[PDB]
Amino acid sequence: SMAFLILVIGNLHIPDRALDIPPKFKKLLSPGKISQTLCLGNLTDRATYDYLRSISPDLKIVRGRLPLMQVVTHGSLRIGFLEGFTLVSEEPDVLLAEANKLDVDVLCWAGGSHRFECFEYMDKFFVNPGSATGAFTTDEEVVPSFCLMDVQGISLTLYVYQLRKDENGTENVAVEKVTYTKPV
């Protein structure tokens, strides 16, 4: 409640490339903690849809071809979400131009890489959450990840959750923290 937490998932590809959001992710997500969920990419699987709705009072699906983008504002930050499959981090000027069309400080896109990535460029913040199911690419395995955006005033703290295999074979959830602060 006192925190404003956005759950960001993308490129689920259920049931065409994956069967389910990994249980070790579901065990971390509980009702009453997430304020809003953005799902990048289509979502046609009834069980996944029902589960996501149980986790937040506000589920927004941003699809392939039913919204084409979504902007959310909290505090002084303006966060844009889109699918943007042709967008790649190796072309930050193309991503920046997209952020400038939406007039957002943070641009989140579910790029065809299916890999978590984030970077800063010209006082803006760019986030690809990867695939929450680890769904393979058409374009080194893909690894499941999702993000939480914790928005406080002019700051966004990004928490990246990733399911990674230890040397002994076990998949465990790792988490990394990145902070963006909008410059004055």
Binding site: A3, L28, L29, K33, L148, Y159, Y161, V175
Partner: peptide
């Protein structure tokens, strides 16, 4: 010291 929002880990 602190945790991520979901309580998975204190950070180191």
């Amino acid at each position: 010291x602190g945790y991520d929002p979901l309580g998975l880990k204190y950070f180191a």
